[PDB]
């Protein structure tokens, strides 16, 4: 709510990720900005330590929900923008079907007049020669449907939804998102009503670059359930 | 939609000093090499100087190391060519170049070296 104010413009985003998965370490840097007021990220990640053992897609959810656009008639229910500038604490397990799982713990912050998010990740269970281990998803994202809901207890939100990778077979594999967050600061934040948001992502490469990378442009948008004839 | 003016050019005497100057608009400074050229009348255009996307390299062409320093002001967006001793060889157009998709030039900026 007082946060919100800090979203007006455009915000510059710096996203930190260590990641060990099945024991292979690897970090991401990226950068880029964020204009909540049309809900859209543009972003370029960079994997710092050479080569990504795993395949791009699989980081995307995990690399700022804050960004998202909320229509007025919603503008009550962002939890993510009202527990700022302090930020929250994002917590995942995600479930790849048949494979292993990624467990991260975030930190959505300002640090100054950037947005940041610092995360580490931690996969086990992995197959070595699995659709992720073995390089085997597609280059390009999916549009889904990310449900919220309040968690009065925690004093924040929590969240569920599947994310669908287009694997090269033709095939498509589900990874179960289950997410989890928590104000840092003692501020008062809005707990909002059951809800979802809207996803559409498009990746990219920049053609100029010779490291391992990957160009996000992504649009979010708040929605809201409408009841049926059953109330 | 991406653009490059130069600007700066005149005439200056042997051993002179001159620093051009290249705005640009449609894309980030800070993001692509940048470069300079020169064209001496009816003579191929002929590469100067650059810098990299990064900015931390800088590379010159033989006759002009250690005279000219290119550099630039990524807030804003502007190029720049210092140019110190000045032969009469150096009389020339010097435009500023990009590549943004496609290679882009601007419309150059007469530098004339006589007394």
């Known amino acids: 709510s007082k946060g919100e104010e800090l979203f007006t413009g455009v915000v510059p985003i710096l996203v930190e990720l260590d990641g060990d998965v099945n024991g292979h370490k690897f970090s991401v840097s990226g950068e880029g900005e964020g204009d909540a007021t049309y809900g859209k990220l543009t972003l370029k990640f960079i994997c710092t330590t050479g080569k990504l053992p795993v395949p791009w897609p699989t980081l995307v959810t995990t690399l700022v929900q804050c960004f998202s656009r909320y229509p007025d008639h919603m503008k009550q229910h962002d939890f993510f923008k009202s527990a700022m500038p302090e930020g929250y604490v994002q917590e995942r397990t995600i479930f790849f079907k048949d494979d292993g799982n990624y467990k991260t713990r975030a930190e959505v912050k300002f640090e100054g007049d950037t947005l940041v998010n610092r995360i580490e990740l931690k996969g086990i269970d992995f197959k070595e020669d699995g659709n992720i281990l073995g390089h085997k998803l597609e280059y390009n994202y999916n549009s889904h449907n990310v449900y919220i809901m309040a968690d009065k207890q925690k004093n924040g939100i929590k969240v569920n939804f599947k994310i669908r990778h287009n694997i090269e077979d033709g095939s498509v594999q589900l990874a179960d998102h289950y997410q989890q967050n928590t104000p840092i600061g003692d501020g008062p934040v809005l707990l909002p009503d059951n809800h979802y948001l809207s996803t559409q992502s498009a990746l990219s490469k920049d053609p100029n670059e010779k490291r391992d990378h990957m160009v996000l442009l992504e649009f979010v948008t708040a929605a809201g359930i409408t009841l049926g004839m059953d109330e | 939609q991406v653009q490059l003016v130069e600007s700066g050019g005149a005439l200056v005497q042997p051993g002179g000093s001159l620093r051009l100057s290249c705005a640009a608009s449609g894309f980030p400074v800070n993001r692509y090499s940048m470069r300079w050229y020169r064209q001496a009348p009816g003579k191929e255009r002929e590469w100067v100087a650059g810098?990299?996307?990064?900015?931390?390299?800088?590379s010159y062409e033989d006759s002009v190391k250690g005279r000219f320093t290119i550099s630039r002001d990524d807030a804003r967006n502007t190029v720049y060519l210092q140019m110190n001793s000045l032969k009469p060889e150096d009389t020339a157009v010097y435009y500023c170049?990009?590549?943004?998709?496609?290679?882009?030039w601007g419309q150059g900026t007469q530098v004339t070296v006589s007394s």
């Open positions: 810098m990299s996307s990064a900015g931390d390299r800088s």
């Open positions: 170049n990009v590549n943004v998709g496609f290679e882009y």
